[PDB]
């Protein structure tokens, strides 16, 4: 097994516990936790054997809670969450305290805002290929588009036919701003293929964009933007 | 751990 | 002849779509059934107009536009197999079908927890077979030699309101799933 | 800071059994396996603030047994009618299926200080996952017990805690389903 | 029914302000009626029955006996609450609170010591039954607190500022 972090991503508001899980390879008893900042930054946090605590700093001790309950998932819980805890954080295993050898999981993006009042779901807009595209370069391009969703938490991918690709796919490095002076954000992904393939109406296709947000206690008129899955449809024409 | 003080059972008869 | 759209599905608990035949003339009316991994046709519609609703699913039709439509909604694992849909031509007596939607209904796995077992056959201790089991839907599986991997597939365990998927390898277990 | 210290112990006949068991304010702090002479805390981590001598335990508990044979011969031996137990279950925790849980069997306001428990799952005894505490004592001249019982909440199984005591006319069961 | 003979004794240590004022209160009980007592207070052996008349008259008229006996307030008491105080008494466990409809109930679970509020809310004083406080056995308390119909407020020694929903 490898290293399996969750959530890939989190957000809370200050004073709010945050917990993360981390699942080590199968057979490894050493576990790390670790964390990075947007600066690159790394800072051991502390680390376990089987149960029991090998090491760990001065401030994982006061504001920080870890256990690794035998069968059970290692976790890794804030106590009164700060904007300055806003990294990310990542667990290794190791299968022998006297190697160095480390294997490290994807890691939960945590984020702490003031309130989770601004936590919006993106709108996702999948946008046909252009006659004019097509015409001159007999490849059909689909763009599919995540708007005003808050904060930038989230997972695109593009399907047909029921099933998930990658081919002829690249998704925006990073979620810009639609409003660089907090803002909501926004994503854009394209999917590129045959303009035969396009043109065929047996083919279905589908942008699903994965958002990370509450789970919770929810006060206000609309509905708790939870973490939730927002998708666009688009058909061959031909 | 220090030790806890206990009443002796008092005999009867 | 009957242009059914799209040839494939694959949807998380929850989500919806809708499926789509066209017709290359008048048709008197049209039905929608669904094969259910024990290939049986279930039916799940009958119109000659207008539309009809029959819990999370609806159909619409129209014979002059030559088109027909099904809705899924809040998908469920119960609603996976291939749809098709068929109609009589007003020309005819026999029916015409679709080339089908096969639909696929992802679950989703709240608490991973990736595991590879191996379990001893109850009655000798010379066989064996390795299972693994209890990750998310994400994962997937491949097939060497006298190695044997199946596909993957998901349990519900209704009493305690739990699923997990699964796959089993035969032929260490350690190298199995490398 | 208001508490209460209680040093119980007794010897019961003709069962032949006798115990020594502390109390804090309602709960057990220890009690001592005579047949073991040891001191068994209520809580693992009670054993580094504090230690008992066993031996004084068991000390107390023979002359206990030998009080015990004064107060028959002068009381003429003058048996004394039984009183049943009030058993009660109850979760230890909100039961969530699929979730780790703990079953609670409650007896209480019953003497002698001696019945037999015994946990059903679907009708059939539990020998795994099950604990008890010994009798505790209350305000009154009646004891006090609990039985736990370690489950995984499912809507398929369902529960029962029988108690068997000289006060009852038969085995007492209260039952418990997720529903 | 079946007959049986119990031989049953509580020493018990009451404190009212820690050291402050310490009583000792000796009780036997033959069967199930309490027979003797010794209370600090009167510093003699009293027979609460005629049963334990024959008892008070022997150990009242061992002098030194009674001398060891009052003395034992601090000897035993005292000296085992200096002791406690150090885990017992200053023990605290934080509640786990959950709201959820059966009449929506308010689960305060897992906490110590037993001194505990739960209230409703503006704050209701109307349709409120609970289950009362409910002994663990395990040194650990639990109450159901349900409104007939939102918020809920917990207030406990273990927690600065209070629970809400
Ligand atoms: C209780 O004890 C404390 C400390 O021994 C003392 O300061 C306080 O005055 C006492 N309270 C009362 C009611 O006398
Ligand atoms: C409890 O069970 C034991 C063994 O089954 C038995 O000997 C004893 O009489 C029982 N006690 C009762 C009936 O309360």
Redesign the interface.
């Known amino acids: 097994m490898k290293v399996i972090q969750t959530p890939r991503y989190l957000v809370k508001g200050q004073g709010q516990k945050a917990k993360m899980r981390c699942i080590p390879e199968k057979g490894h008893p050493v576990v790390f936790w670790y964390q990075q900042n947007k600066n690159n930054e790394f800072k051991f946090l502390i680390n376990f054997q089987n149960q029991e605590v090998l090491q760990q700093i001065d401030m994982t001790e006061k504001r920080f809670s870890a256990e690794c309950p035998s069968n059970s998932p290692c976790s890794l819980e804030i106590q009164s969450s700060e904007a300055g805890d806003s990294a990310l954080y990542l667990c290794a295993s190791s299968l022998n305290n006297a190697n160095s050898d480390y294997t490290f999981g994807s890691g939960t993006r945590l984020l702490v805002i003031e309130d989770l009042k601004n936590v919006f779901p993106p709108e996702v807009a999948v946008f046909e290929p252009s006659e004019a595209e097509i015409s001159h370069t007999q490849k059909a391009t689909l763009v599919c588009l995540a708007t005003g969703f808050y904060p930038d938490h989230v997972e695109l991918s593009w399907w047909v036919n029921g099933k998930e690709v990658h081919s002829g796919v690249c998704t925006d490095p990073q979620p810009l701003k639609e409003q660089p002076a907090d803002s909501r954000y926004a994503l854009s992904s394209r999917l590129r293929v045959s303009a035969t393939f396009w043109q065929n109406p047996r083919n279905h296709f589908r942008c699903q964009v994965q958002f990370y947000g509450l789970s919770d206690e929810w006060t206000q008129d609309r509905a708790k933007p939870v973490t939730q899955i927002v998708s666009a449809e688009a058909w061959g024409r031909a | 751990a220090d030790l806890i003080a206990y009443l002796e059972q008092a005999t009867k008869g | 002849q009957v242009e059914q759209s799209p040839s494939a599905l694959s949807l998380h608990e929850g989500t919806g779509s809708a499926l789509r035949c066209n017709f290359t003339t008048t048709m008197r009316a049209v039905q929608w059934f669904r094969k259910n991994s024990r290939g049986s046709l279930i039916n799940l519609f009958y119109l000659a107009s207008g539309t009809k609703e029959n819990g999370r699913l609806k159909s619409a039709f129209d014979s002059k536009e030559r088109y027909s439509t099904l809705h899924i909604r809040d998908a469920q694992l119960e609603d996976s197999g291939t749809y098709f849909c068929a109609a009589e031509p007003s020309s005819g007596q026999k029916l015409v079908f679709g080339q089908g939607t096969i639909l696929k209904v992802y679950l989703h796995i709240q608490n991973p927890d990736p595991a590879v077992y191996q379990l001893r056959d109850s009655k000798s201790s010379d066989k064996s077979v390795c299972l693994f089991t209890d990750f998310d839907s994400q994962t997937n599986v491949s097939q060497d030699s006298d190695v044997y991997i199946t596909d993957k597939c998901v349990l519900d365990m209704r009493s305690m309101d739990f699923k997990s998927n699964s796959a089993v390898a035969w032929s260490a277990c350690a190298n199995a799933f490398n | 800071e208001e508490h209460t210290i209680i040093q119980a112990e007794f010897y019961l006949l003709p069962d032949k059994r006798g115990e020594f068991m502390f109390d804090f304010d309602g709960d057990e702090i220890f009690h001592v396996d005579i047949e073991k002479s040891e001191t068994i805390w209520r809580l693992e981590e009670f054993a580094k603030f504090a230690s008992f001598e066993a031996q004084g335990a068991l000390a107390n508990i023979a002359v206990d047994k030998a009080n015990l044979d004064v107060m028959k011969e002068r009381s003429n031996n003058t048996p004394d009618a039984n009183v049943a137990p009030e058993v009660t279950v109850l979760s230890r925790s909100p039961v969530n299926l699929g979730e780790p849980n703990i079953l609670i069997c409650f007896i209480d306001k019953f003497s002698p200080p001696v019945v037999n428990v015994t946990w059903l799952r679907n009708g059939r005894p539990v020998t795994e996952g099950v604990s008890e505490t010994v009798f505790l004592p209350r305000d009154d001249h009646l004891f006090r017990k609990f039985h736990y019982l370690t489950f995984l909440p499912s809507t398929d199984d369902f529960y029962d805690c029988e108690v068997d005591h000289w006060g009852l006319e038969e085995p007492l069961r209260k039952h418990w389903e997720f529903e | 029914?079946?007959?049986?003979?119990?031989?049953?004794?509580?020493?018990?240590?009451?404190?009212?302000?820690?050291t402050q004022r310490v009583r000792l209160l000796?009780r036997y009980?033959?069967?199930?009626?309490?027979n003797l007592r010794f209370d600090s207070d009167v510093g003699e052996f009293r027979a609460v029955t005629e049963?334990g008349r024959?008892?008070a008259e022997?150990?009242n008229s061992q002098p030194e006996?009674l001398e060891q006996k009052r003395a034992?307030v601090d000897?035993?008491?005292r000296?085992?609450?200096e002791?406690?105080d150090?885990?017992?008494?200053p023990r605290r466990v934080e509640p786990?609170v959950?709201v959820?409809p059966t009449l929506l109930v308010c689960?305060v679970?897992?906490f110590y010591?037993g001194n505990i509020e739960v209230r409703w809310f503006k704050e209701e004083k109307t349709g409120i039954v609970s289950t009362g406080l409910?002994?663990?056995?395990?040194?650990?308390f639990?109450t159901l607190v349900m409104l007939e119909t939102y918020t809920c407020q917990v207030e406990h020694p273990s927690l600065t500022d209070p629970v809400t929903?």
């Open positions: 029914s079946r007959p049986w003979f119990l031989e049953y004794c509580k020493s018990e240590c009451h404190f009212y302000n820690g000796v009980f033959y069967n199930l009626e309490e049963l024959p008892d022997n150990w006996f034992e000897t035993v008491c000296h085992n609450y002791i406690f150090n885990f017992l008494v786990t959950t959820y689960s679970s897992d010591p409910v002994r663990n056995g395990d040194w650990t639990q929903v």
